Amino acid sequence: TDNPDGIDYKTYDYVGVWGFSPLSNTNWFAAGSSTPGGITDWTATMNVNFDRIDNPSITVQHPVQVQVTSYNNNSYRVRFNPDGPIRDVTRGPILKQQLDWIRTQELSEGCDPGMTFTSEGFLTFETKDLSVIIYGNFKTRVTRKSDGKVIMENDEVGTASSGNKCRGLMFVDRLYGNAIASVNKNFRNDAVKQEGFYGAGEVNCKYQDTYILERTGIAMTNYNYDNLNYNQWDLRPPHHDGALNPDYYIPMYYAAPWLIVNGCAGTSEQYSYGWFMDNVSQSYMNTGDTTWNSGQEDLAYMGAQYGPFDQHFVYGAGGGMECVVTAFSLLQGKEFENQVLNKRSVMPPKYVFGFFQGVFGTSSLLRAHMPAGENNISVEEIVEGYQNNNFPFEGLAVDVDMQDNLRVFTTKGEFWTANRVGTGGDPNNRSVFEWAHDKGLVCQTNITCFLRNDNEGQDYEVNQTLRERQLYTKNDSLTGTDFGMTDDGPSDAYIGHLDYGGGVECDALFPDWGRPDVAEWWGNNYKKLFSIGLDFVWQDMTVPAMMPHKIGDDINVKPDGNWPNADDPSNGQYNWKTYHPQVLVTDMRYENHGREPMVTQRNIHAYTLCESTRKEGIVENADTLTKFRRSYIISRGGYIGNQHFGGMWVGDNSTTSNYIQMMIANNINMNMSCLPLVGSDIGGFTSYDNENQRTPCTGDLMVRYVQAGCLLPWFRNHYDRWIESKDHGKDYQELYMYPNEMDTLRKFVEFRYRWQEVLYTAMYQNAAFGKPIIKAASMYNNDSNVRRAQNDHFLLGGHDGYRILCAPVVWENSTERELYLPVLTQWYKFGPDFDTKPLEGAMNGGDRIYNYPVPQSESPIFVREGAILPTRYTLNGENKSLNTYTDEDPLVFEVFPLGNNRADGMCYLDDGGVTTNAEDNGKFSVVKVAAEQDGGTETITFTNDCYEYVFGGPFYVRVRGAQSPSNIHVSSGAGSQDMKVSSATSRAALFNDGENGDFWVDQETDSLWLKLPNVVLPDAVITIT
Ligand SMILES: [Cl-]
C-alpha cells in the first residue's frame, strides 16, 4: 500500500522560487470549462474540464469542491485532487470535525448561504457580508454586499482561439510534474486599492538597509529548513555571488502558506481577506515579483510541489486585518471538542511569560562539579548572576549539554548535585530541575527526535525500544536510493547524522510518526524527564534538521559547503539538511493510508512532532509532572496550527540590529499567522564578530534587544557559548554580565513582570477568541499612516488588545527614531520609570515626530487613554520569578486617564497552571472593569464573565490623575461600605500594613490608591466623589 494512488513523483529536490513559474503556462493545466455536479450540505461540486494552456485541445476532467466554511465569518474553501479521490486529512490545522461543528451551529441559527447553480451552471452563494459568483471556467468574483465592491477575483489567461482559461485552478500535466497553483488578480499597483500582502510566518524581507513587515511584490517559499542565521549558503539563488543575506526568497523554520491581503487601508472602504493554501509539501507565495520571471506585478499566487489542492479564502466578520486572524483561528478551532478554555490555541502556564536564560555550552549543575575547561560555566553561576543582582528571573533553558552523550531523554551525573544520576525525589541528590525548583525557577530542556544510534554497545533504552518495536523510519524509497548504512544498523533503518558543530555530533534513528504506536511511544519517553523535575519542553531540530549529506558519502560525512549549486546541482543526491526526500514515510496527512516519499509532506513533520509531545507527552503523562501540572512547548519548527501544541522561537538568529528588526517583524507576522506565543533569542544566538567569533553582544545592542523583546510573548536570552569542548560561540551574554547597562536591563525585565497579567490576559484572549497578542500597526483601523510605521510599531494589551503601543529603537548607537502615534485617540508616554512618577501630558494621536528622542535607557512605549491595566507587584518589593507569586503579591488595576470619560479593562485569573483545572474543568475567572466620569462623580465597576478561580489576596485600584476624594463608597454583594484614608503614607506600607478599605493619596505619582478585599473583586460599584 506504498503509494496507494499510483503517483509518479517527478521532483524530489528543493525548488527555489526561481524555479517555480506557473505563469509561464508550459505543461500546466488550467480550468477551461465545467458543468454543475450537485450540492450536498454546504459543498457544491463543479465538474471541471482542465485544458493545457499551451495546447488547449489536451483536456482532463476533475471534480472541484466549493464549500462555504462559515457564513458568519465570511469564509469558503476550494479543493480538488488531480491525482485521486478528494480526501479529508486526518491530521492538520483544518479538520472536518471542526468544519462540521461550525456549519451545524450556523445552520441552527438560520444561516443560509443560498448555494445554488444558476440555469447557466454558474455557482452562486452568499455569506453574511459577501456574495460570490463562479462562472463556467471557474472565474470567480467576490463582492462585498454593503457597497458592491469586488474585493477579490481570480485570474484568467487567454489562448489564441480556444477561450480563456482560469488560472485560479492549476496543476502541472502529470506526464511532466506534480505541482499545483492558484492565481488571483493583484491590485498592489492600483492607485486607490494599493493592496498590501501580509503574513507568511517567519519570512524575512530586506528593503535597502532595513528589515520590513509587509510581504508585497515578492516571491516566497515554505520549505522548513535548518536555516541558521536565516541565510544558509545552500539556499542561495543560482549563481549567487558574494554574501547571502537573510531575505524574502529564503525559507524559514515554520510553514505558513498564508497571506492577508489588505486594500484601501485606512479608508471606510478598506477590505481584508486571508488566503490559506493548506498544503504540507514545499509551497510558494508570490505577491507580484518579476524576479527570475517568477511572477507578474499585477498577479499573486500560491502553489506547491505536490497536491492535493485545498484552499481557504477567509474574509472575517468585522472590519480589519485582525478579524481575518480571528476567523482563521476559528477554522482551526477546537469547539468541536467542547474546550472550555483552549478553543483557538492552548494556554501556557503563567511562567512561560517570565524571563529565561538559555546557554548552549554549560557543563554542570554545580560549580563544585564543573569540569575544568576554557570558559566553562555551571548552571549555578548563571542562577547566581541573576538572583544576586536581583533580576526578575524565571529559570533556564537547559541544552543538550545535560544529556549523556547526546542521548535525548537522558542526563549525566554532572547535572545532579551529588554528581550522579538519580531517579528523582532524593533530597541529597537533586537533578538540575529539582535544584532549580528550590531556587524558585522552572526549566525547559532541549528535546529533538534524533535517537542516537552509535552508542558503542552502551545501553540506550530509547533507541533500543524504537528498534525492537520497529517504530523508526525505514530506508525504503521508490527510486532505489541508497541512504547509507552504519555498523550499528538496523539494516533497514534510515540513519541520519546530528551535527551541532565543533565535533558535537552523532548518528541517529528517527520516529516514523505516521505509524500507529509511534506517538504514544514518543510521549511516554517524557516520563524520564518529568519525573526528575522538568517543567516544560524546548523542541529543536524539528525538520528533522539533519547534517547535510550527499548520497554515496558516509553517514558522518557532509558535502563541500559550496555543493550543491546551479553548476553542480543536487540531482537527487542532496538531503537538503533533513531526510533525503526520496525516503518512504508512513503518511502523516492521512492515517492508515500507506507510505509516501517525504517530499509530499516535508512541512508537517515538525507539526506532528509537537502534536505528539503535546498529547501523548504533556497531557497523557500529566500525573508525572511535579510542580506545575500544566506544561508547554516552545518549538523551532511547525505548520499552521502549531498554536494548539504550544509556541515558537525563531531558531538560530544572530547578534546585529538587523536581527532585532527581524525579531519584531517575525513576531507580528507569526501572530497574524495564528501563532501568538513566539519570540527570538534575546541578544542573538550565534556569534556575529567576523574577526573574533568570541566577542559578546555589545551593551547597547543588548539594551535594544531587551527593550524590543520585553513585551513580546516569548522572552528568553539564549546563545551559543564558546567553551573548550565546543569551540564556537560567544564568551557570555547574560544580562548580569553587563555592569554599565545593568540598571536599564533590570528595569525593563521588572517592567515586563509588572505587566505579566497584560500578557497572560492577552494569551487568554487568544485561546478564547483567537485574537493575536501582538497587533500589526495596520490592524489599527481608520488610519492612513500606520502602514508607513508598520515595520517597527506594534500594539497589544488591555480590554481590546490595542491599549499599548511599542516602537522600539532597532539600530545600535542610536538615540532617536521616527515615531507615529495612531490617530483618533490619545497616548501617554510610559515604560519602566513611570511606575514611580507622574504621567506626562497627553500625546495627540495622528502626530508624526521625526527624531523623537530615545535615550539608551528608554524605549518608546505608550499607554492609550481609556486603558485600565492589571498590574502585579511583589509584596516584599524584591524581584522573584512569576511562578513563585501568590495572590498575596498585589494585583493592581491601574486606571490611566479616561478616553471620552471612560476607561475599560480585563483580567484573566487562574492558578497559573499549578493544575490544569482551568482548561479541564473551567476553573478560571474573567474579571472586567470600567471607569466612568459623570460630572463630579467617578464610578469604577468590577463585574465578572465567570469567577471559578478565587483570587486570595486584596487587590487595588490605582487611579492616575486623581488625588484626595471627599468620599469613596464601595458597593458589593459581600458588603456596602465607605472607605477611609489610610494611615499608611507609602506604597510598601499600604501593601503590607494598609487595611482593606483604605485609600492612599499618592502625591509622588499623582495617583489615588484603593485597597480592597478579595471578596469584592468579582462584583463591585466604586463611587469616588
Ligand atoms: Cl527546525
Structural domain boundaries of the chain? 1-318, 319-806, 807-877, 878-1025
Query: Cα of 821 to ligand 1 centre, how many Å?
Result: 37
Which residue matches cell numbers 532549580?
436
Centre a 10 Å sphere on the Cβ of residue 909 and count the other Cβ atoms it contains.
25
| Separation in Å, CA 775 to CA 141, 312, 779, 973, 1012 | 29, 22, 6, 38, 33
Q: Give the integer Cα–Cα distance in Å for 708 and 405.
A: 36
Identify the H or E element spanning 461: helix 461-468
Q: Give the integer Cα–Cα distance in Å for 602 and 9.
A: 14
Write the CB contacts of 987 (distance below 8 Å, at least 6 apart in sequence). 1000, 1002, 1009
Query: Cα of 712 to ligand 1 centre, how many Å?
Result: 21
Numbers of helices and strands, H then E, in the chain: 15, 56
Phi first, then psi: what are they for 933, rounded to 5°? -100, 125
**CATH code, 1-318:** 2.60.40.1760
Query: Cα of 1016 to ligand 1 centre, how many Å?
Result: 48
Task: Specify the CATH superfamily of domain 807-877.
Answer: Golgi alpha-mannosidase II (2.60.40.1180)
Task: Specify the CATH superfamily of domain 878-1025.
Answer: Golgi alpha-mannosidase II (2.60.40.1180)
Centre a 10 Å sphere on the Cβ of residue 148 and count the other Cβ atoms it contains.
8
Please name which of 606, 561, 539 lies closest in space to residue 579, comparing C-alpha atoms.
606
Identify the H or E element spanning 273: strand 271-277
Write the CB contacts of 975 (distance below 8 Å, at least 6 apart in sequence). 1016
What is the distance between the terminal CA atoms of the chain, rounded to a whole angstrom?
78
Q: Residue 1003: exposed, middle, or buried by beta-carbon count in 10 A (0-12, 13-18, 19+)?
A: exposed
Q: Establish whether domains 807-877 and 878-1025 are of one fold.
A: yes
Write the CB contacts of 487 (distance below 8 Å, at least 6 apart in sequence). none
Q: Give the integer Cα–Cα distance in Å for 858 and 877.
A: 22
Q: Give the integer Cα–Cα distance in Å for 174 and 347.
A: 44
Q: Which residues pair with 142 in a beta bridge?
A: 132, 152
Q: Give the integer Cα–Cα distance in Å for 415 and 364.
A: 5
Query: Cα of 509 to ligand 1 centre, how many Å?
Result: 17
Query: Cα of 541 to ligand 1 centre, how many Å?
Result: 4
Give the ranges where 824-972 is alpha helix by DSSP (H).
917-921
Please name which of 455, 359, 369 lies closest in space to residue 420, comparing C-alpha atoms.
369
Q: Give the integer Cα–Cα distance in Å for 403 and 410.
A: 5
What is the distance, to the nearest Å, from the Cα of residue 891 to the centroid of all Cα atoms in its chain? Answer: 28
Q: Give the integer Cα–Cα distance in Å for 975 and 504.
A: 66
Please name which of 815, 774, 580 lies closest in space to residue 663, comparing C-alpha atoms.
774
Give the ranges where 46-175 is alpha helix by DSSP (H).
96-108
Please name which of 486, 520, 525, 490 lies closest in space to residue 506, comparing C-alpha atoms.
486
Cβ atoms of 292 and 219 closer than 8 Å:
yes
What per-residue string of b and e applies to 27-45 under the rule 16 or more CB within 10 Å gives b? bbbbbbbbebbebeebbbb
Q: Please give the radius of gyration of the chain, using alpha carbons only, rounded to the nearest integer.
A: 29
Which residue matches cell numbers 490576559?
761
Please name which of 302, 263, 333 lies closest in space to residue 75, comparing C-alpha atoms.
333
Order across the sheet with 902-909: list the strands.
902-909, 925-934, 937-947, 1020-1024, 968-971, 977-978
Cβ atoms of 271 and 151 closer than 8 Å:
yes
Q: For residue 852, give the amino acid letter.
A: Y
Q: Which residues pair with 52 in a beta bridge?
A: 29, 55
Write the CB contacts of 272 (distance below 8 Å, at least 6 apart in sequence). 260, 261, 262, 263, 315, 316, 319, 320, 321, 323, 324
Which residue matches cell numbers 530586506?
206
Query: Cα of 894 to ligand 1 centre, how many Å?
Result: 41
Query: Cα of 681 to ligand 1 centre, how many Å?
Result: 15
Environment of ion ligand 1 (residues, CB < 5 A) = 253, 542-543, 545, 636-637
Which residue matches cell numbers 510558494?
284
Query: Cα of 650 to ligand 1 centre, how many Å?
Result: 9
Query: Cα of 577 to ligand 1 centre, how many Å?
Result: 10
Q: Which residues pair with 543 in a beta bridge?
A: none
What is the distance, to the nearest Å, from the Cα of residue 847 to the centroid of all Cα atoms in its chain? Answer: 32
Identify the H or E element spanning 435: helix 432-438
